Amino acid sequence: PRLRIGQINLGGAEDATRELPSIARDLGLDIVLVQEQYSMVGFLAQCGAHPKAGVYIRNRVLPCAVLHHLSSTHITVVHIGGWDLYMVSAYFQYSDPIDPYLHRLGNILDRLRGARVVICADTNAHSPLWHSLPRHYVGRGQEVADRRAKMEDFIGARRLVVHNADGHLPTFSTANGESYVDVTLSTRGVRVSEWRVTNESSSDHRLIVFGVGG
């Protein structure tokens, strides 16, 4: 009927990474787009020596192709056969300029022009688009403001849809407080349903779950 997707930054923790299979089984997730995984595990599609993004395919039989020419350590691109859907897991390194990542994503979207694409990214950016509070993106310095602007400009230029729904738990919780930096986007036309933030993961980030159609 519809694919069940998970999105989660694992904080580089081995335990949070190793608990994914059980969570996927419990919630019936088909695919989980991860960031900051403990890469030494063996159930993740990931690229490079020290990947910061990856894709976990709970059911191996599901036809899934990792697009090598479009993937890198921080952005993993896969194509799900049958559902004719491209999915992207991305990690925008905290404290580093966001520009390089947007250019990379832009190139990916250019090469996948006309296709159905879903992007699960830890943007480490704050915007009312994904329900960040005013105190998260206003009065927090020029970098936060610039990062927000660049992300919003990108989303607009690429005509992408933000699926994060209002009224849900913050996607990131630490000692400094709670924030919303994990975003679920897609090209126009892709139907995303039941989007929600859960407390299934032991990571400081909260596992996002949603469904996508064929």
Give dist(CA 75, CA 73) in Å, integer. Answer: 6
Single out the residue of 202, 200, 207, 172 nearest to residue 15, CA to CA: 202
The residue segments making up the domain with residue 109 are 1-214
Number of domains comprising the chain: 1
CATH number reported for the structural domain that contains residue 192 in this entry: 3.60.10.10
SS (H, E, C) the chain: CEEEEEEEECCCCHHHHHCHHHHHHHHCCCEEEEECCCCCCCCCECCCCCCCEEEEECCCCCCEEECHHHCCCCEEEEEECCCCEEEEEEECCCCCCCHHHHHHHHHHHHHCCCCCEEEEEECCCCCHHHCCCHHHHCCCCHHHHHHHHHHHHHHHHCCEEECCCCCCCCCEEECCEEECCEEEEEECCCCEEEEEECCCCCCCECCEEEEEEC
Give dist(CA 155, CA 22) in Å, integer. Answer: 34
Phi, psi of 87 (to 5 degrees): -130, 140
Q: How was this structure determined?
A: X-ray
107: amino acid identity, one letter: N
Beta bridge partners, 185, equal 119, 162
